[PDB]
Structure formats: C-alpha cells, structure tokens
Design a protein around this nucleic acid. Structure first.
Length: 1095
DNA sequence: TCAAAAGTTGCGAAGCAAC
C-alpha cells in the first residue's frame, strides 16, 4: 500500500507472476523515506506550481522559506506567466499524440483484450495510462510533472552540455581522426546528438518524479519508462518549433559509409529577456535539494562523493578535503572591467579579439569555416557573463561586495575542475571580470617593495618573459613600452575613467598600440595602470591585479623525475636543471639560471637535437638522387607557409623552438607517430588556405594583377622574386602528392600513387583532401617525424622511454582480461533467465545482478591505489554488451540503444593517467590541504594566480608542493596491482579473440604467429619482473637525492625557491663529478638492502 | 595522446534489409 495507494487507477495488477496485464511502473519504483519532490500527491502540478510563481508571498509559502530570491521581481513574474501558458499547449500535443497511437492498427483494441502491448519496445508508455470508458488516457499527475521538467530543460540544457573534440567526432561519424574534413568538428559542437539530448532530458524527468529505483527490477523498465517519456516530449518540442532537427548524411563526402546522423538544436532567447536574470525558478520550487543554482554569501556547495563520470570510484578522504577548501573561496566582481565591456559593445569585442565581420564572397570556403568557429566562442562567453551580472546586481546595491562560490569535482585523471561551461577557470573573457584576488599596496614612492610587485603584474600581462630576466631588467623594458607604443592607448583609458566615453576609433587605437601582445589580460593591465595614474591617494591603492606562477615545461619535467631508473648520468643533470632542479647551488633561482648559466629550455634543446638527426638521415642517402629531391621538396614547402622554418640562400636550414612545442607535449602523453604527422600537416594546410583568401582580396582591388604578385607579393622584393616563388609552390605540391615513400627491409623506396595534383587552382574552392592528403602525410611521417622522435628521445633519455613501454604493456594486458571476463559472465546469466517463464527477452538484467558480476572481478585488482588517489583505467560506458534498443517514441523513431557501465580496452591511455594524476594532479591536491596553504587563489592546472600582497610566501609554498609530489612512485603502484592480477588469472579460459590481443603486446611479430597458451602465459610474467626492477631503482634514487642540498624553482615567476635542507655539499663540482658522487651513494644504499634480506 | 558515449527507418511487435 506504499506506492499502490498513490496511483490506484493504473492499468494492470502489480504482481510479477500474474496472468493478465502487469504494471511495471509499480514493480520498479518505491516511495522514498523522506520526500524529495513537492509535486508528489498533487492533482494538477502544472496549476499548483503556476500558482506559486504568481507572487513573491506565494513563492515563499510553497517553498517554506523566510525570503525569496531578490531577483524574483515583477518583470520576471510576468515572463513566467507566459511560460506556464505555453506549457499547457505542450501537454495538449502529448495527449493528442497518444490517441492517434491507439487508433492505428487497433493497438488499443488489442491491448484491452489481453495482449501485452506494454512490454514492447515502442509501447513502454502504456504502464502509466488509465482506463477511460472504452479507451485509455494519460495520468494527469505524472504527465504534468514531466512537462514541468521539460520546461526547465529548455532553459539551461545548452549551458550544461559537454565539449566534443576531434577524437569524439571521429567516433561518431566513423571517419579516421587524421582525415576529418574542414568544419565537421565545429558543426557537431553547435548542436547535440539524439543519445545525449534524450539522456540528459530523461535524468530531469526522473528527479522531478521523486521516486526510488527497485534493485530487484529489470534495467529495461527502471531505465526505459523515464526514457520513453523523454523521447515523446522531445518530439513535441520539434512539433512546436522550439527544437530544430537536422539530418546529415556522411555519404556525400565518403561514399564508402552509409551512416546518417541527426542533430538537434534549441532555439535561443533574446539577450535582453528578463527571464535570463533568474532562469531556475521552477527547479527551486519543485526539488527540496536543487542542483542548478548560484551560491551567495554563506551558501556553500555540498561535496560530491563519486568521481566525475565514474560512479564506481569514490573520492578518497584526502581528495574530499581539497574540494572543501577550494569551494570556500569567495569571488568578486571588478566593476571597471565590466563597464569597459558594455561600453565597447559586443560587435566591437568581436572585431577586436575575434574575426570581426565576415565577407563570405572574399574568403576561401575552408578559411571562412574556421573564422566562424572562433567567433562563436567569444560571443557565447560574452552572453553568459552578462546574464550572471543581472542576477548578481539584484542581491545588493553595491555589486562589488557580493561573495560568490563555485562547485568543483574530481576528474577521472585526478584533476579538480569547475562545474559549468563558462567560468573563471575555463573562459578567459570571464577570468578578467570575476577575481578572487585583492591587494592594498603603497605606491607613493617608486622605490618601494610594493611598486616592484605592481610592475611584475603589468609586465607579465603584456607578454614579457619575467622569469628569464632580473628585476632591474624587467623594470627597464616595461618603462620603454609604457612611454612608447602604449602611450596613445593609456591616454584614451585615462579619459574613459574620468568621463565614461570611448572614441569611435577605439579598436584602431588598441590594435595599433598592442599589436602582437593583444589578449584579454593585456586590457586589464591598461585599465589598472590608468586607474593608478588618476588616483589621488596612492598610498592605499586597492587592485585585483595578480601574478601567475606558471610551471616551466611542467609535463616533460614531471615524467623525467617520476619514471626514471638506473644510475645517474651527466646529461640528466644538465637537462633536469632546465626545469628548475639545481644540485649544489643554495638559494639559486630560475632568473639567475637563465640570465647567466643557460638560456635554453627543453623545447630549444629538442630542436637542436632534431637538426643533428636530420643531417644523419640526409647523408644516409647521399647517392640516392630521387630520395634527396623528395626531402628537399618537403623542406621547401614548409619554408613558404611556416615561420619557424627558414631556408638559406646557400641551402642552410635553421629551425626555431616553435616546431618542438606540440610534438614534445603529446609524445609524453603516448601519442603515436601518425598523430604527430597528421597535426603537422594540418598546420601547413591552414596557412595555405589563408593565403588563397589574400588572392581574392587583391584581385578585387586590381583585376589586372598577375597570379604570382597576387599571392606572394607581400613577401617578394620584385616581380621576378614573386614569379620564382610561385614556381616552387606548384612544383613541390605535385611532387609530394604523386610519389610517396614506402619502408621495407629497413630502407625507403619511392612508389608512385598515380594521383598527382594537376590543373588550375581556384582560390574560392581550393581544397586538399582524399588521396592527396594521405600522400602528404606519408612524406612528413617518414622524413620529418622519425628524425624528430629520435631527437626527443635523446633529451629525455632512453631510460624514461623504457619505463613508459612496460607501463603501457602491463595496463593493456590487464584490461583485455577484464573486458573478456565481463562479457563471458553476463552471457551465463542471460542463459539462466531463458528458463524463467516470467522473463521476456529485452528486460536485460537487474541492478543487483550487475553489481554481483562486477564484484567478482575484485580479485584481479581493477583499481590502482596510490594511498591518496584512485584510478580506474578500464572503465567506460559502451552499448555493445546490451546490443538492443531501450525505448523509442510513439512514431517508431528516436530509437535509443541501451548503454551500461562496463570495462573496455585501455590502449595507450595508461601513460596519461599516471603522468597527470601523480604529477600536477597530486601537486595541486597537496597545495590545497598542506599546512599554511595559501588563501584567495585561482588554481588552474599547472598554474596559479596570486594576489600582489603575498607573492613571495605563496610561491615558496608552491615549490614545496612540487617537491612533495616528486616523491611518488607511479610504477610501484602499478606493480602492486599487476602482481595480484597474475596470481588469480587463468589464461586457459579466455576466448580465442582475447588470446590474440594479449599476444600482440607480450610477443614479437616473428614469435606470435603460432604461439600457444603457455608461451603467452610465460611472456606475461616477464613483464611483471621488469616492473619490479624499475620500481626498486626509482625508490633508491629518491632516497639518495634527499641527502644532498637542492633548490626547487619549478614555478619561476617571482624568484622564491624552496630548500630541501640536505646535509651533503655538492658545490664547486662539474656535472661529471656530481654524477660520480651520486652513483657512490647509489651503491651504498643498494648493498645495505641486500644484506638485510640475507640477515 | 587524457578529460563520456555515438546512424536512420519500414515491418510488426524482434531484428534483418535497404540507403
């Protein structure tokens, strides 16, 4: 009588083994102990809620609160009266759609005679209907509560959607990642797919119903009934033009595939709509514990219990203390920046910091697609920021004294991420209007220690490398700028402060003054400096300007220290000092290192190594004229359209550090050679398309110009020079796209593809795609990426790349077994339910049964524990296991497959998990919970913003967190889990397909052709012993380094290093002598451990 | 390379065939 008394008129009995029609709504949901929604028990939820939104007094009575939100004023109330009236029209559409369903093919007649039409995939919505004479009808309470959830979804769905990159789009369309056409990635980010639109809508409907799931009920009904309602509601929104549905077929570009995907977009509201100032009135009136809201003053967000997108993993007690600390920080609004934005306007913001207005006639088709993509990001963040200001402004008269709190969560890689899409952590436009930092400096004298802190904030914002020069040098360079190029822009800003108006040529003045330093933080620097000039009391200046303590190549430096074994080498000592680890130099900062000792970083060192490898490759084929010409053509082509590569008149090749930035970062994350080659070619093609646009522009100005001058005029001294460069571009393009190199027996041969690029170029429709793109990627892969990888390996060392190889092999093998066992166990269960008279194929399993299968995998160690973090590499949500439809709508459309939480193959994802989680992920967690942790800071990944009053103390603490995180042992954590897996595994019970996959990671090509199960088992145990040796070597290295004096300056902005107070002096020694001293301590530690085992 | 997942529709009432 718990749920059978609330809904007594629903069709069918509530017995799982009855004879007639059974009601699976009452067999799957139970009333909660304490109420969660205020719509349970009402008769007309659409009228009860609409009554509560008609006044301020009624809203407080319904919600049982002393005072409502101050933003709930008269204008918002009127806008909410039209929304409810619009919601009554959506309900009428749903009621009429059902009656049509029951009238076709006599579905209603058959269902009344005993046919179980409520168990079909397309008829699961018959479990919430009631009899009415000779026909059926909806249940008013359940239907109207679903419409209320639909109206709230229509207002906030867009701002909560996720971000899909090129990798995600490839998985949807099925095309290869490296050959994704132009504009396809950004097209899929405008709208939402069917799976993500229905799933997000279904979650809202279930929450508003306020019931609990039954653990012993099938997953096809506890998840299908809410989903069948979501598809019907979305169909009604399309009919009402509130949602636009678009169908895109992939056969127009790739004839091979036949996929046809549909995209949905929500019609947006006006930027001046009063409803944007308080868009969550419905949610807070229905849910006892709302989720979508904004927190002011003493409202502190709650702490989450499970990892983001990972319900099986719980946040450790140490990780929960970090979330609590970061959610207590108060954010404030900077009024002068907000007034500058609205006076400038949205159109002028796009012109300045975006692409401005676009003339599609005078642009290339591929160029114009990219330009439109960059305009959307700036416009979306502008609209989001100013909708927040409207809500903040109603709280009090002074907008700058209203505290703001934000909610965080733990990502699956161990990072702390803000919730939302456009927040201070993610959007750079919003970063300069909402700050947690503040200061009160004394700037009456220019020689004060407070003025030097003020200059450091301005210099860094204006793109000056403040961590490579001393304080006196930085001050000199800033003064040259403030009285040179930047003077006209500062003068305009001074007049704006006193008057409040801007000139008509504001964009021209800022573009001319800033130039290549243009950014959002560069505008704040001009605003703060011009505010200081006009101030009358300079001894108490209050500013929110900040200084960021960025990490110098945080990625590669972390990996080189956490995953290197064996003895010390003089090259490791030299290269590790470029990241900020100094041995034998007390109180040494990075400003002193770069100024006197070495002015190169890891990016510059790798480029120097690449040049050495390139010369070796060139001389290797000194007698191969066809090969030599192919290498020359590739380098000539990249010279024209890339600023980092230049060709001398004598053939000398000079490279800059720009080309080694992206490849070095992604090589650490385990990216293959094919990924780097695809990215490098993409940069070259983008520059080519931009050049074709200039041809169109020059032709319009003068239609009698020559082709060579219209394209290379800006880079040619005379007409003859332009003609020469045009010939090079034509010849190089046809050479690379005709013949490609193929590697076999270890040497390279030239093979003709027969698809050379010939014809006349059209500037409007010029495009490189298909077999022409693949030829370009083959030349770059075998002539530029292979030498590049050799150079990177030399700088980071061969010992580091050996640790990453074993790490990837162990995780891939373990994940393969976990996935195969999971599938093998759900098939045995489904074969037992086949003998159940009351079970129908399609209900799948229950939640209790799914937990039992997962709980049987605990002896294979699916999770890696470091003592303060937990990682689950193999977890995913795939629809392959279920392999059936969950629910459709009444029109036999919008079919949604069933997805469950099941393990999947890892691949190369093992390397990023350990490098990021135990690296900057662990360091930031330490920083928040350590003793005397800094306050009022914004902690971006591998960075931190600090107020001007405590730059010195907070920087020292930041270096101490880095030192603490450098004592971790990621290889030891993997070894402990892999040792337990090899103790309880049984290789003889694996499927033949799984055995082949294991052999691809544990055996060589010539040995895995006809391997047995004993060969695979034996080869897998050798990896276990390889991981044991690496972990022992890393452990000894950290103990030896703790005995000597060190200085840590990884965050190099300010110049405050941390000391490890060792008691062994390694000063006045060369790097060769220091390596000998450390190797002596390595052997003393090793011998002591071995004697302990013997004794 | 890490931070989620991925086609649509007739016929008949599940799952293959057509595009």
């Amino acid at each position: 009588e718990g749920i059978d008394a609330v809904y007594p008129s629903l069709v069918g009995t509530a017995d799982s083994k009855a004879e007639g029609i059974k009601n699976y709504f009452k067999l799957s949901f139970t009333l909660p102990e304490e109420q969660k929604s205020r719509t349970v028990g009402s008769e007309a939820p659409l009228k009860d809620v609409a009554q509560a939104l008609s006044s301020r007094a009624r809203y407080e009575l319904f919600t049982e609160k002393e005072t409502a939100n101050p933003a709930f004023n008269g204008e918002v109330i009127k806008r909410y009266k039209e929304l409810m009236e619009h919601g009554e029209g959506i309900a009428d559409i749903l009621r009429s759609r059902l009656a049509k369903f029951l009238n076709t093919k006599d579905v209603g007649k058959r269902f009344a005679q005993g046919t179980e039409a409520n168990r079909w995939v397309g008829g699961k919505l018959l479990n919430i209907v009631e009899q009415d004479g000779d026909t059926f009808k909806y249940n008013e309470q359940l239907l109207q509560t679903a419409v209320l959830a639909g109206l709230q979804w229509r207002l906030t769905a867009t701002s909560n959607t996720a971000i899909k990159d090129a990798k995600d789009v490839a998985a949807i369309t099925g095309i290869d990642q490296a050959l994704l056409p132009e504009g396809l990635v950004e097209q899929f980010d405008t709208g939402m797919t069917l799976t993500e639109a229905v799933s997000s809508l279904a979650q809202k409907i279930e929450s508003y119903w306020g019931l609990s799931r039954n653990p012993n009920a099938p997953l096809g009904y506890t998840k299908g009934i809410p989903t069948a309602m979501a598809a019907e509601i979305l169909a009604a929104f399309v009919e009402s033009t509130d949602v636009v549905e678009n169908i895109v077929d992939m056969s127009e570009i790739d004839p091979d595939n036949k996929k046809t995907i549909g995209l949905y977009t929500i019609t947006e509201l006006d930027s001046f709509d009063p409803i944007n100032s308080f868009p969550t009135a419905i949610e807070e009136a229905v849910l006892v514990n709302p989720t979508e809201k904004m927190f002011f003053g003493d409202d502190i967000p709650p702490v989450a219990n499970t990892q983001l997108r990972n319900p099986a993993v719980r946040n450790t007690p140490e990780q929960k203390a970090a979330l609590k600390a970061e959610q207590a920080t108060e954010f404030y609004v900077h009024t002068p920046m907000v007034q500058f934005y609205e006076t400038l306007g949205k159109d002028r913001i796009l012109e300045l910091m975006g692409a401005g207005t676009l003339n599609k006639e005078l642009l290339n088709d591929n160029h114009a697609k990219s330009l439109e993509g960059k305009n959307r990001s700036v416009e979306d963040s502008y609209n989001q920021l100013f909708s927040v200001i409207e809500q903040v402004r109603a709280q009090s008269e002074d907008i700058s004294t209203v505290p703001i709190h934000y909610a965080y969560n733990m990502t699956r890689v161990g990072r702390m991420q803000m919730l939302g899409k456009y927040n201070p952590q993610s959007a750079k436009l919003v970063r300069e209007a909402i700050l947690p930092t503040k200061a009160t400096l004394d700037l009456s004298n220019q020689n004060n220690e407070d003025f030097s802190a003020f200059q450091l904030g301005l210099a860094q914002a204006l793109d000056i490398k403040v961590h490579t020069m001393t304080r006196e040098v930085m001050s000199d360079e800033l003064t040259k700028l403030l009285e040179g190029n930047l003077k006209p822009a500062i003068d305009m800003m001074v007049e704006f402060n006193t008057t409040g108006s801007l000139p008509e040529n504001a964009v021209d003045v800022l573009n001319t003054a800033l130039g290549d330093r243009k950014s959002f933080v560069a505008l704040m620097a001009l605003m703060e400096y011009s505010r200081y000039l006009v101030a009358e009391d300079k001894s108490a200046f209050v500013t929110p300007l900040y200084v960021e303590a960025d990490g110098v190549t945080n990625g590669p430096i972390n990996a080189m220290m956490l995953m290197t074994g064996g003895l010390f080498t003089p090259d490791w000592i030299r290269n590790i000092a470029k990241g900020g680890l100094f041995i034998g130099s007390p109180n040494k900062t990075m400003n002193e290192h770069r100024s006197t000792a070495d002015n190169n970083d890891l990016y510059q060192a790798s480029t120097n190594a690449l040049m050495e490898s390139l010369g070796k490759l060139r001389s290797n084929y000194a007698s191969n004229m066809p090969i030599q010409s192919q290498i020359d053509s590739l380098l000539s082509l990249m010279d024209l359209f890339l600023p980092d590569i230049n060709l001398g008149e004598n053939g000398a090749l000079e490279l800059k550090r720009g080309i080694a930035k992206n490849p070095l970062t992604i090589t650490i994350y385990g990216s293959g050679a094919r990924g780097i080659a695809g990215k490098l070619v993409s940069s070259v093609t983008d520059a080519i398309y931009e050049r074709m646009s200039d041809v169109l522009k020059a032709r319009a100005k003068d239609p009698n110009i020559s082709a060579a001058m219209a394209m290379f005029g800006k880079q040619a001294a005379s007409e003859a020079h332009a003609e020469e460069l045009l010939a090079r571009f034509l010849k190089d393009m046809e050479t690379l796209t005709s013949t490609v190199p193929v590697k076999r027996k270890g040497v390279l041969e030239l093979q003709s593809t027969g698809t050379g690029a010939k014809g006349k170029i059209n500037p409007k429709t010029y495009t490189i795609k298909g077999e022409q793109l693949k030829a370009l990627q083959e030349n770059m892969l075998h002539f530029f990426v292979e030498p590049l990888r050799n150079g990177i390996t030399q700088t980071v060392g061969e010992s580091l790349v050996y640790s990453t190889e074993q790490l990837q092999k162990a995780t891939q093998i373990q994940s393969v077994v976990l996935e195969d066992m999971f599938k093998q166990r759900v098939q045995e269960k489904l074969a037992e339910k086949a003998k159940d008279p009351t079970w129908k194929k399609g209900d799948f399993l229950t939640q209790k049964e799914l937990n039992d299968i997962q709980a049987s995998l605990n002896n294979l160690a699916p999770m890696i524990e470091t003592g303060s973090q937990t990682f689950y590499i193999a977890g995913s949500e795939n629809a392959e296991v279920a392999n059936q439809v969950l629910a459709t709508n009444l029109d036999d459309r919008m079919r949604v497959p069933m997805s469950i939480y099941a393990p999947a193959q890892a691949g190369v994802a093992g390397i990023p998990f350990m490098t990021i989680g135990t690296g900057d992920g662990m360091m930031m967690q330490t920083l928040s919970t350590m003793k005397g942790a800094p306050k009022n800071t914004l902690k971006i990944f591998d960075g931190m913003n600090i107020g001007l009053n405590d730059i010195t103390d907070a920087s020292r603490k930041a270096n101490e967190a880095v030192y603490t995180s450098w004592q971790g042992n990621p290889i030891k954590n993997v070894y402990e889990s892999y040792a337990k897996f090899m103790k309880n595994v049984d290789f003889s019970k694996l499927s033949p397909e799984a055995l082949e996959a294991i052999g691809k990671s544990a055996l060589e090509y010539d040995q895995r052709e006809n391997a047995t199960v004993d060969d695979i088992a034996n080869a897998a145990s050798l990896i276990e012993r390889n991981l044991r040796n690496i972990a022992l070597g890393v452990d000894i290295r950290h103990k030896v380094l703790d005995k000597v004096n060190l200085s840590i300056d990884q965050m190099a902005a300010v110049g405050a290093p941390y000391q490890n107070n060792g008691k062994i002096d390694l000063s006045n020694m060369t790097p060769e002598q220091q390596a000998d001293e450390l190797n002596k301590l390595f052997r003393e530690e090793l011998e002591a451990r071995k004697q302990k085992v013997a004794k």
